[PDB]
Amino acid sequence: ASRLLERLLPRHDDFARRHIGPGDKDQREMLQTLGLASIDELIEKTVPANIRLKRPLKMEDPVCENEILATLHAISSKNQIWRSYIGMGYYNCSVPQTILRNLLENSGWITQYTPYQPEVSQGRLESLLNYQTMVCDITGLDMANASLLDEGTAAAEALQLCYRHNKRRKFLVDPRCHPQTIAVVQTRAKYTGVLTELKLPCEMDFSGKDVSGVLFQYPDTEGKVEDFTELVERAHQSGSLACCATDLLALCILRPPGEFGVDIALGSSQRFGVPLGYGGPHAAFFAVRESLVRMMPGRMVGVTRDATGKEVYRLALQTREQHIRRDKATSNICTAQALLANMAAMFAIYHGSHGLEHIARRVHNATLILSEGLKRAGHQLQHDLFFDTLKIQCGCSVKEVLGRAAQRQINFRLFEDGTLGISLDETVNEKDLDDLLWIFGCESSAELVAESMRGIPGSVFKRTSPFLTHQVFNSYHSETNIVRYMKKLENKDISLVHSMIPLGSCTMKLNSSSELAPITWKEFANIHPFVPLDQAQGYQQLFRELEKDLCELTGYDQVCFQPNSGAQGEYAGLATIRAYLNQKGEGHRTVCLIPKSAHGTNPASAHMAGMKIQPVEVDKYGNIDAVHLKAMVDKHKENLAAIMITYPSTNGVFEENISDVCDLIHQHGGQVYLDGANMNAQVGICRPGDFGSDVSHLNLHKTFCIPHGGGGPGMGPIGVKKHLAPFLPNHPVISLKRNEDACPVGTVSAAPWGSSSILPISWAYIKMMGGKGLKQATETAILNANYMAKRLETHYRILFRGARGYVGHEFILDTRPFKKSANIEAVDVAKRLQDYGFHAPTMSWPVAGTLMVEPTESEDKAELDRFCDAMISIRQEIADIEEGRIDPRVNPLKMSPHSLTCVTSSHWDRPYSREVAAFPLPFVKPENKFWPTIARIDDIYGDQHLVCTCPPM
Amino acid sequence: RLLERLLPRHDDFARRHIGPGDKDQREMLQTLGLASIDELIEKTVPANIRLKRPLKMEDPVCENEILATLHAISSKNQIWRSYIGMGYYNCSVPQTILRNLLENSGWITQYTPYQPEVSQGRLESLLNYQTMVCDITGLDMANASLLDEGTAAAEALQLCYRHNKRRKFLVDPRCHPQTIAVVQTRAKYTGVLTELKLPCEMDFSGKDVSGVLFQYPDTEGKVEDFTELVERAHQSGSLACCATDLLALCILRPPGEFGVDIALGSSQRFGVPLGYGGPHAAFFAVRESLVRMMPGRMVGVTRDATGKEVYRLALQTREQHIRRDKATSNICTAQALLANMAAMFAIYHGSHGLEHIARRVHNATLILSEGLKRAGHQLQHDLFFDTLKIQCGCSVKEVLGRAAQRQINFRLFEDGTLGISLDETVNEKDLDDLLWIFGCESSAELVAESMGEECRGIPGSVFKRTSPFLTHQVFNSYHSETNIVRYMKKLENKDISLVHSMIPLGSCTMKLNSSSELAPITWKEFANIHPFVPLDQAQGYQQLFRELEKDLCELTGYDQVCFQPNSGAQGEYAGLATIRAYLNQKGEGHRTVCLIPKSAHGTNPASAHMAGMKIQPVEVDKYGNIDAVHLKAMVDKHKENLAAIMITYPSTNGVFEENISDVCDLIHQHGGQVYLDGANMNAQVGICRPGDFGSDVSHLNLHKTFCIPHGGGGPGMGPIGVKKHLAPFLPNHPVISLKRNEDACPVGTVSAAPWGSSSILPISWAYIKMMGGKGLKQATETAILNANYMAKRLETHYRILFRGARGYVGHEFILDTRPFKKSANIEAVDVAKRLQDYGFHAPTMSWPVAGTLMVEPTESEDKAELDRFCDAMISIRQEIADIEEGRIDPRVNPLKMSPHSLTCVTSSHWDRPYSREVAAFPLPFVKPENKFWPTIARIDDIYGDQHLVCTCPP
Numbered sequence A: 001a002s003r004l005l006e007r008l009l010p011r012h013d014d015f016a017r018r019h020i021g022p023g024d025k026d027q028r029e030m031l032q033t034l035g036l037a038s039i040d041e042l043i044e045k046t047v048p049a050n051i052r053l054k055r056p057l058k059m060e061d062p063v064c065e066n067e068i069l070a071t072l073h074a075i076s077s078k079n080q081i082w083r084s085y086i087g088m089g090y091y092n093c094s095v096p097q098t099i100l101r102n103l104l105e106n107s108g109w110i111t112q113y114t115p116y117q118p119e120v121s122q123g124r125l126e127s128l129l130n131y132q133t134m135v136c137d138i139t140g141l142d143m144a145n146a147s148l149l150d151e152g153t154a155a156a157e158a159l160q161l162c163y164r165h166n167k168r169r170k171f172l173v174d175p176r177c178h179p180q181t182i183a184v185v186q187t188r189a190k191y192t193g194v195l196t197e198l199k200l201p202c203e204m205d206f207s208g209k210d211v212s213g214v215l216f217q218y219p220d221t222e223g224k225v226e227d228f229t230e231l232v233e234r235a236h237q238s239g240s241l242a243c244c245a246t247d248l249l250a251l252c253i254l255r256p257p258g259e260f261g262v263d264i265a266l267g268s269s270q271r272f273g274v275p276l277g278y279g280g281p282h283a284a285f286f287a288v289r290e291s292l293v294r295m296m297p298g299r300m301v302g303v304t305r306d307a308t309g310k311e312v313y314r315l316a317l318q319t320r321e322q323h324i325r326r327d328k329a330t331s332n333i334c335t336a337q338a339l340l341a342n343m344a345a346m347f348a349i350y351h352g353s354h355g356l357e358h359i360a361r362r363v364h365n366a367t368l369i370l371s372e373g374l375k376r377a378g379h380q381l382q383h384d385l386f387f388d389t390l391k392i393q394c395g396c397s398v399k400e401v402l403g404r405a406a407q408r409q410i411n412f413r414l415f416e417d418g419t420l421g422i423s424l425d426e427t428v429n430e431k432d433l434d435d436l437l438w439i440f441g442c443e444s445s446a447e448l449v450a451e452s453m454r455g456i457p458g459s460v461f462k463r464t465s466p467f468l469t470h471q472v473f474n475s476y477h478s479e480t481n482i483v484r485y486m487k488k489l490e491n492k493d494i495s496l497v498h499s500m501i502p503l504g505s506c507t508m509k510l511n512s513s514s515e516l517a518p519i520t521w522k523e524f525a526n527i528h529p530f531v532p533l534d535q536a537q538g539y540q541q542l543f544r545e546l547e548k549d550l551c552e553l554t555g556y557d558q559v560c561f562q563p564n565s566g567a568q569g570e571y572a573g574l575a576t577i578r579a580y581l582n583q584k585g586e587g588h589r590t591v592c593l594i595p596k597s598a599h600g601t602n603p604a605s606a607h608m609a610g611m612k613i614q615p616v617e618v619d620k621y622g623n624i625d626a627v628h629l630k631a632m633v634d635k636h637k638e639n640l641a642a643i644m645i646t647y648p649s650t651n652g653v654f655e656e657n658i659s660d661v662c663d664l665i666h667q668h669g670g671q672v673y674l675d676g677a678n679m680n681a682q683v684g685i686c687r688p689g690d691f692g693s694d695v696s697h698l699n700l701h702k703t704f705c706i707p708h709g710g711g712g713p714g715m716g717p718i719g720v721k722k723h724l725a726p727f728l729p730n731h732p733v734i735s736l737k738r739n740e741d742a743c744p745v746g747t748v749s750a751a752p753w754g755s756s757s758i759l760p761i762s763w764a765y766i767k768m769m770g771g772k773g774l775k776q777a778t779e780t781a782i783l784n785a786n787y788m789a790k791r792l793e794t795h796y797r798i799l800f801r802g803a804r805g806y807v808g809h810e811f812i813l814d815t816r817p818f819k820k821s822a823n824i825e826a827v828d829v830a831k832r833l834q835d836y837g838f839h840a841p842t843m844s845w846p847v848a849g850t851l852m853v854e855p856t857e858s859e860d861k862a863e864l865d866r867f868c869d870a871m872i873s874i875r876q877e878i879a880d881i882e883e884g885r886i887d888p889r890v891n892p893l894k895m896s897p898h899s900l901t902c903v904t905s906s907h908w909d910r911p912y913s914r915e916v917a918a919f920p921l922p923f924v925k926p927e928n929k930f931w932p933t934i935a936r937i938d939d940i941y942g943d944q945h946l947v948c949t950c951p952p953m
Numbered sequence B: 001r002l003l004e005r006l007l008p009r010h011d012d013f014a015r016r017h018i019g020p021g022d023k024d025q026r027e028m029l030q031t032l033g034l035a036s037i038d039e040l041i042e043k044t045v046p047a048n049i050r051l052k053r054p055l056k057m058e059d060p061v062c063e064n065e066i067l068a069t070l071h072a073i074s075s076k077n078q079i080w081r082s083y084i085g086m087g088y089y090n091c092s093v094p095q096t097i098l099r100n101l102l103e104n105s106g107w108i109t110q111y112t113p114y115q116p117e118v119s120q121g122r123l124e125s126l127l128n129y130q131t132m133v134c135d136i137t138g139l140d141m142a143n144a145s146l147l148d149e150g151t152a153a154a155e156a157l158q159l160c161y162r163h164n165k166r167r168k169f170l171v172d173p174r175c176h177p178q179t180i181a182v183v184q185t186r187a188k189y190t191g192v193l194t195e196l197k198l199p200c201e202m203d204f205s206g207k208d209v210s211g212v213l214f215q216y217p218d219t220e221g222k223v224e225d226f227t228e229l230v231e232r233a234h235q236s237g238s239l240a241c242c243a244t245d246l247l248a249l250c251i252l253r254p255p256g257e258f259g260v261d262i263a264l265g266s267s268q269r270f271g272v273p274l275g276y277g278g279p280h281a282a283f284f285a286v287r288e289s290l291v292r293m294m295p296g297r298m299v300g301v302t303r304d305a306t307g308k309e310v311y312r313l314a315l316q317t318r319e320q321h322i323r324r325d326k327a328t329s330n331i332c333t334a335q336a337l338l339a340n341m342a343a344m345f346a347i348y349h350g351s352h353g354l355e356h357i358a359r360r361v362h363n364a365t366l367i368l369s370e371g372l373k374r375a376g377h378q379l380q381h382d383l384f385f386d387t388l389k390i391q392c393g394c395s396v397k398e399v400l401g402r403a404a405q406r407q408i409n410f411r412l413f414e415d416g417t418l419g420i421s422l423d424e425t426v427n428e429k430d431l432d433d434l435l436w437i438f439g440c441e442s443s444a445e446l447v448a449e450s451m452g453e454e455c456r457g458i459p460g461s462v463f464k465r466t467s468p469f470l471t472h473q474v475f476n477s478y479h480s481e482t483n484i485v486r487y488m489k490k491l492e493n494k495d496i497s498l499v500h501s502m503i504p505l506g507s508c509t510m511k512l513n514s515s516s517e518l519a520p521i522t523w524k525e526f527a528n529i530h531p532f533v534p535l536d537q538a539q540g541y542q543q544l545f546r547e548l549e550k551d552l553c554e555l556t557g558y559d560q561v562c563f564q565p566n567s568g569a570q571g572e573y574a575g576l577a578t579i580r581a582y583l584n585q586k587g588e589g590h591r592t593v594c595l596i597p598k599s600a601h602g603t604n605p606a607s608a609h610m611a612g613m614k615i616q617p618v619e620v621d622k623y624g625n626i627d628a629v630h631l632k633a634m635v636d637k638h639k640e641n642l643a644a645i646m647i648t649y650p651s652t653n654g655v656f657e658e659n660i661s662d663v664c665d666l667i668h669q670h671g672g673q674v675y676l677d678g679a680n681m682n683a684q685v686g687i688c689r690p691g692d693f694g695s696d697v698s699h700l701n702l703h704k705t706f707c708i709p710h711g712g713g714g715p716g717m718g719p720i721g722v723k724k725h726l727a728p729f730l731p732n733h734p735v736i737s738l739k740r741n742e743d744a745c746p747v748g749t750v751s752a753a754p755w756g757s758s759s760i761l762p763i764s765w766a767y768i769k770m771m772g773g774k775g776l777k778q779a780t781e782t783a784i785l786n787a788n789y790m791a792k793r794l795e796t797h798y799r800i801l802f803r804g805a806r807g808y809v810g811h812e813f814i815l816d817t818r819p820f821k822k823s824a825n826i827e828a829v830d831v832a833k834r835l836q837d838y839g840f841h842a843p844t845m846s847w848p849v850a851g852t853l854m855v856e857p858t859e860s861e862d863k864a865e866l867d868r869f870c871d872a873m874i875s876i877r878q879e880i881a882d883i884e885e886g887r888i889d890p891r892v893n894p895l896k897m898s899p900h901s902l903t904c905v906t907s908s909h910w911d912r913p914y915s916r917e918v919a920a921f922p923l924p925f926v927k928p929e930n931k932f933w934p935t936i937a938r939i940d941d942i943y944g945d946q947h948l949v950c951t952c953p954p
């Protein structure tokens, strides 16, 4: 039926053929291994017939890769790049081009995920330790984590930490915090049942000994630098904690929160060399007094020792986190902002304390200069002491000032009260100051104003304490040196530039160059999140197009982009459910059913959304236990708010009767939350919204190619049925309401569409793949997983399978029996894989002592076979131990991983060869050998001796 | 100003570019026993040549503003759809190759693969390039690139002369005009006559024709059978040379199949941007019988010390650095990085993907042709690949008016006809615009329906390609984006580069290639402009040229700069040719003698030979300086016939000559011109200027002194600055005029594009604009400090071979390793390979003095890095002392066994009388977590040349 032109002149390229690893020959061969005639037969045997799409996805014709950037350009060029001096927690900066090119645009940095396998991850672990050290030095607090999502969520994590600490149900918020910070804090509080009160310090009453904590900002949203010593002391005297939202650049010249008693310091690291990104991504910072560390949210790098006593790095105190403690975790956060934390660390390293002081002094002096010019022109400054931010009462019409501002394409903050906020930044030069003085009708140039001329250096607030005294911040100031340091860390880390990283529950698929290109385009990267919307019409088109596509892939009616991780999506989803229930008079329903199979974020998110969790058991086949489910529905039917189902579940299987589960919950007055993170098994085949789900978040960083970034960034947009739409998150600065019916749950992220600048990645993937491609991707994800399962099934037990014996896109290998037979544990297999040139699969989750394997469609048959051959070779190593052919204490498995130092040493007293140690199979060649950089990590020692900043060189 | 007090400059790029800060410099000065930088300079650079007043430059631009500054220029360019053709064709550069290779410092910072054991990645990739060229052209061996199409065609002409010494060369007038101009220029000054003849006009009967050059498809688009022409050539003892197109040859029977001896062209449309002329790797392939006369580098397969199959540069005695004026060419820096881009293109697509692209382009061209015919236009040629020649049925003006409205360029032929060359980028929408331009009142859809699926054009012709290509596994394995990224990273990681450690190559200036400098070269406003557009579409480039010229004139003391020469050697060639044209014009054409000190770089004599000059070597005195007695004697001898001298200053011996003005005066007084090789300007910039002390003309190496990346052996740019008396004779170009006055008397054309590789000039512009006058001076000062610091630290362990008047070197120096041959049976190569174990690429090995090392750190490396290198050399000296004093076996020791591969050091078998730790981690800074492994044992240089294999082995 094709036009003749299409026969003579076919498509230039099909991106699916670049994205999807196995071609026709690979797929036939894998199907032959499975004893199947076709892909359709596989799908038919895997995905329940009754949930499958009736018609193919309705998508636009696929866009050739050689046109995708021009296509996207026609959108991005509709944005306008003004000079934004809005402030409000986002400040333009001069992103060092060397960090941008050698880290952000380097696949050796961005394709790896969370550093669960430390011995092949020491580079990003070191960098994240650098980040923590930097945060602790500058804030003056004892320990910092390895990033939070944004400023607002960090402030909410502070509120919740206070609750966890002293269990008081009142939290005081200074109204001079940024508005979006207040909104996110108020939302978190609302659904956790804590009362917030907006009170100036002088209005705050702690005497009731009923205040969990207080949040204030320094400098505050108006720009003012204030002494909070007395406030903090009053808080402490009544058993309350003190939380300070702050600014790393300001703290380069301001005495920090640590020196005035603050228990928690937090903010955004964005202006340390990361783009505005029209809201993100940015790594937020969070630091606390050592006595609070046990309650820390998120990841934290710690120093430990390896097997030989060498000083090395690992994620510390991991039992705090969602994947261990589930609803009892310190937070729901999983994916964070690792890559951007590392960008900010490299910024601090490149500049040192001396360079950062120089930048900060310059910004402050530019602000002082403008300040004097405006006063001479008859305008009033509301605050005399400030860092980079003025609050101005215009001596003339505000309209006339903004008219001139518009003429020079400059944005200010417009306060409610008719005054203007101006926040200067690293990028502000003489020319900009002259424009600004002209805007305010100051006849005097910047040069002239400077002539007649204090601030922070002349004040009691002058910083007198050192920071970044560690060698790491004093060694890499030449561009040659920073490039070498970045490369050194990169080369310590196994990533998708080396080999398949088959992490179950992570979807480590291709992050394509064409998808990634636009995220550093200025029209995406260099827009302030809070500009007037007529400057971001390109973004608006992007959002509409991606929304429409995601709606079609999922069967939902509306998408909300605000949630900036999967866990945030779950939290937003549940909150929307509760707002829906409240609105319709059913607010008493707070019970959330959660299968024990569901991802750990699910119960943590339900706890964060103030729900009562009822676990639901899973049966022996790996499915939701139908008997228990029916019993828990019956038990809770009066109070039932929701179920959270992961589908297919974390056990790797499709439940045969998921519609029936959805019907049962609906019949008893509850809503269905479906965790969409496993949509890599669904896209183009079935849709959660078709089979009875009400709301689902998606992991754009899993299914839709946003890079794993060493542990972030992510995006967790939620798709909802239209009955939930009126209750979707909005934002106090930029309005997200679609209807007059709107009844927003609140605000879950600091920026209205979260990390907007990385959405182009998923838009590009979707537009290049089209309907046919996206389907093929899912088909091949399922094929690849089942092929691997088939190859391995006689060597390892496949723990769970679907009703006809097939898995989804991932499966579990039950390594548990080897404990009794050979004293071999999952960890031994995981470390030994490193010697075979592979990052382990997901280790000891969701079932202790097992491995969860997810190849993705992006890896080809040869690569799958290398991995299966490694596992089969390892099985034979286990059999050697089982059958007494090798020492059961000293063997490759127990001694893994084998470092370069180990294998090149003059001393060799192992009962196996150096070749068995390091080159166990012929595909592991000296010319492609990736070395674990350290011997086996000591997990216990690190937690018993907690060191979470850079140790002396 | 007080503003600068309150509001200092945001940043100073010099502090990022220059490795040593204040503490490092003071400490190095203390080591030298000197009080200040000025004292060092005063003691080093002769007072009489130094600047009178400081450089007059613009205020330095902060790094955080350089890209906005450059954007104000680049945005003045206009990006049309250019269907001009003429050897440049838009293509779809795979973004993955662009990001993971062109924008990857692990690919682009290294230079020529002189140290094979730490260079197997780019050597493999260049072997891929060669294999690709040989497969597609059907010839036996190909090089690892040339500069451009036109120079490749000229190399072919010269190869023919070298082969049979006949002094007549026949050129088909249907070659591209720029190809013809470069070929005619080469011929003019080599004393070969060229005759422009159609094949039927070509007379070989005299048996006086060296060779013939024709093109397939030709510049008008025609596909022609040249079998008979080639046979006639061969019958009379002549060679046949064919300029061609790698994409066309995906579906056309290739020149190899119709007897051609040499096939050449541009690899540009295999995944490289237009670049407003470059850079692009030219290809050049020959019959096996001609390989000995091959120009440029060529990768060969050999074995390592263990018998493993590995890669090295082969038959190196052909090249300038060995044979000087007797080399097969002057070429040094080529287009390595861009050859590797084109290889990765072919690998990513395979023969099947390339066939797909080629068939699509051809079918688009067939569609367009059928539409134009139906609209009443005449096609001049029925059989073509991608290029039509159209006699408009209506007014050309009316057509071009519509073309302008859709921002589409055609080629405008002299005879009033239009050339249209379609390319990979052409889609339905473009075809529809083109049909509308020609007033067809059809659509591409409609035209397709009228055509049917009758196979027409090349598939339906006797020219259909039937022979396979790219059958090697390398072209059939890496078609997923995941796989190509992994392959590119695998090769990258085999190669030591500036992302690892200092690469102190004498005569290379391995300085910082900064991210900010590099960013713009892949901006579309620089990368995606056809070199031959109307100039009103390239006004940003015009401002770039003006600004860079003005800066270069100020740095050099010259009056005008010409950007056409696309390597240092090409600059030398252009410079000498200009000198000869100047001499010709004033009636002094008899003067052809060029004096060349033996210290001068090997390119100098090769270039003089290429420019038809008689070379008189001049000796060097025991101190390393031009021998005064011999110089005066050679001047006296050649007085009547003296055309030029070529001086490297400071010379390749690493030293400033005390009386260079006197040398210049002597040559001038005897009627000659002074060519000064500016490649060593990193010891001069901001301190002295060649033009201020008697130089008439210099080339610069922008890829040494001015930060263009070394690219694994290219690209470079070799612009020449001249005094105004030489300016009228500067190169022009037949397509885009470079004449300033009616006074112009151009030497000819030396490069295929008027400003050569335009798209990489922004790098040097950016360096200069960020550094300013003060920064550039500091760079030079610190280059000199760093070299002298190293020399001082090493001088009690190694002999420093040459020093200046007061004992100081310039930016580089020579370590005399020769005595260790007698004392320890240790050779320069042993020291070079042993450095690999210490984590360093060797310095320049056995040049310019056999058995020595030449060391150049540059200003970009800091004291800690210099100290690591000196400590390695001191440790190695002690290893030599252990051999000298019989403390270790003289045959089996780390030095003789170097380099130590991963396989070697991890083997179960170890029977060396030294430890694995001494082998691989000889000093504490060489740590397991930073260890760079030589991927192979020591290369066997003899074996490779005795078993010549120059394509991928099975």
Ligand SMILES: Cc1ncc(COP(=O)(O)O)c(CNCC(=O)O)c1O
Binding pocket: A114, A333, A334, A335, A505, A506, A565, A566, A567, A568, A599, A601, A646, A650, A675, A677, A678, A699, A714, A715, A716
């Ligand atoms: C099934 C599932 N659900 C929820 C999440 C939460 O997404 P965030 O990571 O964006 O908050 C993940 C993340 N998968 C990554 C991992 O488990 O390590 C997941 O696999």
Ligand SMILES: Cc1ncc(COP(=O)(O)O)c(CNCC(=O)O)c1O
Binding pocket: B112, B331, B332, B333, B506, B507, B508, B567, B568, B569, B570, B601, B603, B648, B652, B677, B679, B680, B701, B716, B717, B718
């Ligand atoms: C002093 C000198 N002169 C001329 C050239 C020739 O420049 P091209 O390579 O651009 O042709 C070089 C190249 N230096 C590199 C080397 O010696 O191998 C050089 O060092």
